[PDB]
Design a protein around this ligand. Structure first.
Ligand SMILES: [Ca+2]
Ligand SMILES: [Zn+2]
Ligand SMILES: [Zn+2]
Ligand SMILES: [Zn+2]
Length: 136
């Protein structure tokens, strides 16, 4: 494989055959992974092929998703704690999120965002990417 990019795994990625069957192992955040940077669709979902393996990992977990804030957002380490020293992001700013929504112990859903590491945890509440806040 001659076309290869390196990216941190931002979310523990299940490894899948070309048919979208789980192979029983994972790639782990925040290790680097080598991928062929060509999007591959399998049963409606996007993957990258791991370099020199007939293995596929979800794009969302690697290069993630461009999302636009619909509301001012604080950056959270956990349910009740802001990432230390962080400010806010504003309605209209663009954020890279990785992976599906994650349910914290408060019961609310979060997106892991660019820069999140074990010593620098960075999440935004999912609702801040939706128009309707009928919950305030
Ligand atoms: Ca807010
Ligand atoms: Zn609002
Ligand atoms: Zn409001
Ligand atoms: Zn609101």
């Amino acid at each position: 494989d001659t076309n290869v990019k390196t990216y941190p795994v931002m979310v523990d990625s299940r490894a899948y055959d070309k048919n979208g069957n789980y192979l029983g192992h994972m790639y782990y955040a925040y290790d680097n992974i080598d991928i062929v940077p060509t999007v591959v669709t399998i049963n409606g979902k996007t993957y990258y092929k791991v370099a020199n393996k007939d293995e596929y990992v979800r794009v969302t977990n690697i290069t993630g998703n461009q999302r636009t804030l619909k509301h001012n957002a604080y950056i959270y380490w956990s349910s009740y704690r802001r990432t230390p020293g962080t400010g806010k992001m504003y309605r209209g700013q663009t954020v890279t999120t990785y992976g599906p929504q994650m349910k914290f112990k408060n019961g609310k859903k979060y997106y892991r965002i660019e820069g999140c590491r074990n010593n620098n945890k960075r999440y935004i509440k999912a609702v801040n990417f939706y128009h309707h806040h009928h919950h305030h």
